[PDB]
């Protein structure tokens, strides 16, 4: 499912992401935008053999099990296919664990390179929240 900007914002808010660990909602919407383009079904394989899954492009080496990443840690205790659902509950629950891991949102390369330090508020502008 390809979410609309305001639709995603509202579902993320409902799920407790606005200001989670100090990150305003605009940050999370911006990250989803550049990581997956708001598409829950997005996947991309990496050179190390791991693969990123879903709306927030969560990596298989550490967070989920896809049964094809030797040495995966599966820290979110779930198969990576779960992160591709139209229901973002799993993705949000896992992202909460990732963002709390010590390096914050820098865990997401697109956030760090395209969202960090920008007016992230523009991402939720015009939405009924």
From Swiss-Prot:
It catalyses: Hydrolysis of (1->4)-beta-linkages between N-acetylmuramic acid and N-acetyl-D-glucosamine residues in a peptidoglycan and between N-acetyl-D-glucosamine residues in chitodextrins. One of its GO terms (cellular component) is cytoplasm. SUPFAM superfamilies: Lysozyme-like. Its main location: secreted. In the egg white and polymorphonuclear leukocytes. Its EC number is 3.2.1.17. Pfam families: Lys (PF00062). It is found in: Secreted. It comes from the Eukaryota. It is an enzyme of class 3 (hydrolase). Disulfide bonds join 6-127, 30-115, 64-80, 76-94. One of its GO terms (molecular function) is beta-N-acetylglucosaminidase activity. SMART domains: LYZ1. The active site is at 35, 52. Residues 1-129 form the C-type lysozyme domain. Keywords: Allergen, Antimicrobial, Bacteriolytic enzyme, Disulfide bond, Glycosidase, Hydrolase, Secreted, Signal. Substrate binds at residue 101. GO terms for biological process: cell wall macromolecule catabolic process; defense response to bacterium; defense response to Gram-negative bacterium; defense response to Gram-positive bacterium; killing of cells of another organism. Lysozyme C is capable of both hydrolysis and transglycosylation; it also shows a slight esterase activity. It acts rapidly on both peptide-substituted and unsubstituted peptidoglycan, and slowly on chitin oligosaccharides. Belongs to the glycosyl hydrolase 22 family. Monomer. Lysozymes have primarily a bacteriolytic function; those in tissues and body fluids are associated with the monocyte-macrophage system and enhance the activity of immunoagents. Has bacteriolytic activity against M.luteus. This is Lysozyme C. It comes from Gallus gallus.
């Amino acid at each position: 499912k390809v979410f609309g900007r305001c639709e995603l914002a509202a579902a993320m808010k409902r799920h407790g992401l606005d200001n989670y660990r100090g990150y305003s909602l605009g940050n999370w919407v911006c990250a989803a935008k550049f990581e997956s383009n708001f598409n829950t079904q997005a996947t991309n394989r990496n050179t190390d053999g791991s693969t990123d899954y879903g709306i927030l492009q969560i990596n298989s080496r550490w967070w989920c099990n896809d049964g094809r990443t030797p040495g995966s840690r599966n820290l979110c205790n779930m198969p990576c296919s779960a992160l591709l659902s139209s229901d973002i509950t799993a993705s949000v629950n896992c992202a909460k664990k990732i963002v709390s891991d010590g390096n914050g949102m820098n865990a997401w390369v697109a956030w760090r390179n395209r969202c960090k330090g920008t007016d992230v508020q523009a991402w939720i502008r015009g939405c009924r929240l």
